[PDB]
Each structure stands twice: as C-alpha cells, then as structure tokens.
Design a protein around this ligand. Structure first.
Ligand SMILES: Nc1nc2c(ncn2[C@@H]2O[C@H](COP(=O)(O)OP(=O)(O)NP(=O)(O)O)[C@@H](O)[C@H]2O)c(=O)[nH]1
Ligand SMILES: Nc1nc2c(ncn2[C@@H]2O[C@H](COP(=O)(O)OP(=O)(O)NP(=O)(O)O)[C@@H](O)[C@H]2O)c(=O)[nH]1
Ligand code: NI
Ligand code: NI
Ligand code: NI
Lengths: 199, 199
C-alpha cells in the first residue's frame, strides 16, 4: 500500500509547483499518483495534467466546498475514497500525493489521511510568517519555505526567517526552495525516499 | 456609530499593508481605529503600531485560535466586543477596520461584524487565483489585487487576471494595487467615502 504524502500550506505558496517538480523527477523510479483539492474548481488537476507531470488517469481532482482543512482533517472521507480508488486501480503505487486547498495557518492533515506531511509557505507572504506559528510550521514532517527569489522585493531577510524557523521547529527539518529554478528539490526527494521508506 | 470595514484575504496578500496605507491617508479626515486578528499571535497589532499608522490605543489585537473565519463569521463575539469597546472608548469614530487572519478562499465576514468588505489577493499567489473563485473574489464589496510589481517574477499576466476578474465579478468594483509603492489607493479611499457614507 502506497505512502500517502499530504502537501499543505497557504494559498499560492507553491504546493502545485512542488508536486509538478517532484512528479517529473520521481516518476521514472517510483509509481506515483496525485489527488488535488480546491474549494470551487478543478484547476490544479488541469494544471498538473496539462504540464504532463503524470499520465492523466494518475491525477484526480476533488472539489471540496467549504474549508480545505475539513477535507484533509475533520472529514477526510472524499480524499480517502479517492486514494482508495487510485490504489485499487493501479495496484503497484508507491506514493500518492494529496494537495490541500490553500488554507489558514491552523490547517493540518489527519494522520488517517497522511503518512507524512509537507507544509509549504513562501517568502512573499512575509518575513514574519514562521513566527505566526501553527502546526504546519511547527509540527509538519517537513517545512518548505518557497520563493526565496522574492525576498528582496518584499523586504524579507532569509537570515531572520531561518532563525525564526529554527526557534519554531527545533530539530524538525525544513528547507528554503526556489521552485522556479528547482533549488531545494533534491533534498526533498531524498527525505521522501528515506523517511517515506520507499522501495 | 462607526462604519465597520472587514479586510479579508489569504495569508500574506497585503491586508496589513493596506490598513497601514489607508490609515496614513485617511486619518487626517476621519476618526479611525483597527482590530487586527491572527490565530496564535498579536503580531499585526505590533506591526501597525510600530509603523505609526494610528496611536497605539486605536489598534487592538485579537488572538482567535482555530480558523480565522470562525472569528469573523460563525462566532464573531470577541471581535464584536472589541469593536464595541473601541467605539465607546473613542466616542466619535467614523470607521473601524477589522483585519481577518489570513485564510482560505471560502472565508467571509458576517454582516453583523462588517458593513463593507474588502478582500485582498495578490499576484504572487498566481495568475489563476481570480478563477479559483469564492465569495471574497466574487461578492466582496471591493476586491484588491495587490503586489502587481511581482507579476514578472511569478510569470503572471495582469491582462489575463483583469479579464478573469471581470468575468468573476461583473461590475463589482476592484483595483490592482502596489502597496510597496502606494499605487491604487485612491480608488479604495473614494469607495469607502462613498459607499461607506462617511460624514
Ligand atoms: N518567483 C517564484 N515564483 C514561484 C515559485 N514557486 C511558485 N511560483 C509561482 O507562484 C505562484 C503559485 O504557485 P502554485 O504552485 O500554483 O501554488 P499553490 O500553493 O499550488 N496555489 P493554490 O493554493 O491555489 O493551490 C505561481 O504564479 C508560480 O509560478 C518560486 O520559487 N519563485
Ligand atoms: N513587493 C511587494 N511587497 C508587498 C506588497 N504589499 C505587501 N508586500 C509585502 O508582502 C508581505 C505581506 O504583507 P502583509 O501586509 O503583512 O500581508 P497580510 O496579508 O497582512 N499578512 P497576514 O495574512 O499574515 O496578516 C510583507 O513582506 C510586505 O512587505 C506589494 O504590493 N508589493
Ligand atoms: Ni495548487
Ligand atoms: Ni496582516
Ligand atoms: Ni476553517
């Protein structure tokens, strides 16, 4: 049975960009599928399918209504059914990603739905976002701080963000990324293959 | 009694920057106060106070816990009491802003708490955010699309975003802003003075 990786974070932080890059880099080694969530549309399913990240039948969209965290935590029924339909259809899957709808800082995945959690924030949301806290920043299995290339335009210091993040997470891993260039991707891939116990 | 203006939007879109700019521009004509919200911190209260947007006692922070939308919609009692205390303390306020915690695209203010709503998204969240919809984009009294200066770095077309916004909102007013520079504020001020019936 496949590892379920939940990818969460605020609106626009780079979750879909992360899935696209991970799928393109890992799909020749591992059998993958993706469940995307959005409240009102299936836009991210279309984006990932049109980008060719995986074959279309490996990418499923769920339109949740309401809060994204409800669909990944309080009532995960739809996402669990979609994961079941994929696992039964493909049989040999190693890893299924679930992209949350973008949400507020209190949102996390239920352990019933996600075996590992990646939380994605981005620098343009502000230097102080790590200090504003929440379980995505403090307790996710892996935190991604994306869009470092935008730091000079919003006036954020990456040294400050790194210090604040370390104060919030202790020994729990995190990395800066620039998903436009792919910077920081290989380390996330290594974390998934290891802590996800792939193979 | 003062006009209550709710300012909502996803994490990091520029709500506090908008409040800073509106306060600095409007405070010489109108008597203002601000209630800031966040889930785990009072950081935005500190940020506005340190920026000198208003005197310290005109800016009150509420730490909500849970989802930001609960505090501005389903159970707004804490915010309602903070708005009432500011109104009684200052006696003659024309307008009180309430900044939501950054949230998902389904978040709105109850009419009990907000007379007018401003919803703030930003270009770095993606060209496609207007199309992802929701009542903040489609039904808010005024929509702000902030951080236009970041469009070339994220690869977003403002022409496309404007076309999609017109389809989502019809004639309901909106504007692009660059709050780093102050562009676009005059439209928002004129809307508040007119539809807010100030004076
Ligand atoms: N400059 C820059 N832009 C980035 C980076 N990562 C993503 N972007 C841009 O950021 C925007 C949002 O990316 P996207 O992957 O759609 O984020 P999301 O978190 O999936 N959005 P949603 O919450 O709607 O699902 C896009 O315009 C994308 O090009 C980065 O590292 N640097
Ligand atoms: N380049 C640029 N940066 C902007 C603009 N508006 C805001 N910023 C930057 O964007 C980041 C977030 O702004 P902020 O006002 O804190 O947003 P917010 O929506 O109030 N955040 P929160 O959801 O945490 O309350 C800050 O680093 C701020 O400097 C803009 O138009 N252009
Ligand atoms: Ni996405
Ligand atoms: Ni703010
Ligand atoms: Ni919620």
């Amino acid at each position: 049975h496949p590892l379920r990786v939940g990818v969460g974070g605020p609106v626009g932080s780079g979750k879909t960009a992360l899935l696209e890059a991970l799928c393109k880099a890992m799909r020749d080694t591992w059998q993958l599928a993706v469940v995307t969530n959005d409240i009102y549309t299936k836009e991210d399913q279309r984006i990932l399918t049109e980008a060719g990240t995986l074959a279309p039948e490996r990418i499923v969209g769920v339109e949740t209504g309401g809060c994204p965290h409800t669909a990944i935590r309080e009532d995960a029924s739809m996402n669990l059914a979609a994961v079941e339909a994929l696992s039964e259809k493909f049989g040999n899957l190693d890893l299924i990603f679930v992209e949350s709808g973008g949400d507020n800082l209190s949102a996390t995945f239920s352990p019933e739905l996600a075996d590992l959690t990646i939380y994605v924030i981005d620098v343009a949301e502000g230097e102080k976002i790590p200090r504003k806290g929440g379980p995505g920043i403090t307790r996710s299995d892996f935190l991604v701080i994306n869009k470092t290339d935008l730091a000079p335009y919003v006036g954020a210091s990456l040294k400050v963000m790194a210090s604040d993040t370390q104060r919030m997470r202790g020994d729990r891993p995190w990395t800066f990324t620039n998903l436009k260039q792919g910077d920081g991707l290989s380390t996330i891939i290594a974390f998934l293959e290891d802590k996800g116990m792939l193979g």
